[PDB]
Amino acid sequence: VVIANAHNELIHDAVLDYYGKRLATCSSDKTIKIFEVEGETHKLIDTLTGHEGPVWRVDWAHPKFGTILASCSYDGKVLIWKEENGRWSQIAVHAVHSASVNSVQWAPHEYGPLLLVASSDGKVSVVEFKENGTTSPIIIDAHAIGVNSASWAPATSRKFVTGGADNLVKIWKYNSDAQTYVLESTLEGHSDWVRDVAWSPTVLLRSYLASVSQDRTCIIWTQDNEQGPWKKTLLKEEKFPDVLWRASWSLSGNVLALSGGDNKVTLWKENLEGKWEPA
């Protein structure tokens, strides 16, 4: 199934929603597009407008809140969108960062309608939408140089991993006696900017993290339990041909989808040894 020419400017993100039927894209044209794919057909449904700069990413929210989509852009702001009564409209706007926002992600539906945001300004913001609408977020300084990604850990006590341009990967946990997310662990292992970080939703004892970097390597970080440390495990002994840009875990099977710069997508799974191989 292919939807050629969804945009005329280069596209940076395409995400299907909770039912994996409703597509959504974003690119330099500074717009988002909603699609409806079936067998091998497709129908545009709208074009979201507002961002003053190329749009970097989008994330669909859990259906239990409505039909929402979040986006962020080089313009250093985040826009939420809604499809009420049959038409999309900018409900809220989040802009507390002073540089390009590169990632945005809806927390687990159990936490409510929270949003995880990371920016080149080095900070990360956590945002909920009050009873009235406005937003009173959490802002933390999380990386030097710039933050490129941030992902939520599955639900139990709330944790999320960030990936900065300081080559570091970082786990965060919420604390009461601070009313903020505090730095739980710093994981060193990349020699160049970390482009993305994905926390696997696998519900097994062991937790899985996958970080991708400008150094042409993918690292799977794992933690057996609370007393265990985060163990480093290169996805493969040899570096890759080009820069790895994204990492995505399936919802089941704990299968990793790696997006390279040689515009190639490799798939991996774990084996008896604890080493990865092509799935």
Numbering used by the authors: 2 to 157, 170 to 292
Mind quoting what the paper says about this structure?
The outer coat forms a sparse rhomboidal lattice in which four Sec31 N-terminal β-propeller domains interact to form twofold symmetric X-shaped vertices. The vertex was refined to a resolution of ~12 Å. We could clearly distinguish the β-propeller shapes and unambiguously rigid-body fit the available Sec13/31 crystal structures. Close analysis of the vertex β-propeller interfaces identified a region of density that likely corresponds to a negatively charged loop (residues 339–357: EQETETKQQESETDFWNNV) that is disordered in the crystal structure. It appears that this loop becomes ordered in the assembled vertex and forms an interaction interface with the neighbouring subunits. The proximity of the 339-357 loop to the N-terminus of Sec31 might explain the vertex disruption we observed with Nhis- Sec315, as the tag might displace or interfere with this interaction surface. Indeed, when comparing the soluble cage vertex with that obtained in this study by overlapping one of the Sec31 β-propeller subunits, we find that the relative position of both neighbours is shifted by more than 15 Å. In the context of the membrane-assembled coat, we see a clear gap between both the ‘+’ and ‘−’ pairs of β-propellers. The vertex structure we report here for yeast proteins is much less compact, with deviations of over 15 Å in the relative positions of neighbouring β-propellers.
COPII mediates Endoplasmic Reticulum to Golgi trafficking of thousands of cargoes. ER export is mediated by the coat protein complex II (COPII), which minimally comprises five cytosolic proteins that form two concentric layers on the ER membrane—the inner and outer coat. The inner coat layer consists of the small GTPase Sar1 and the heterodimeric Sec23/24 complex, whilst the outer coat layer comprises the rod-shaped heterotetramer Sec13/31. Here we visualise the complete, membrane-assembled COPII coat by cryo-electron tomography and subtomogram averaging, revealing the full network of interactions within and between coat layers.
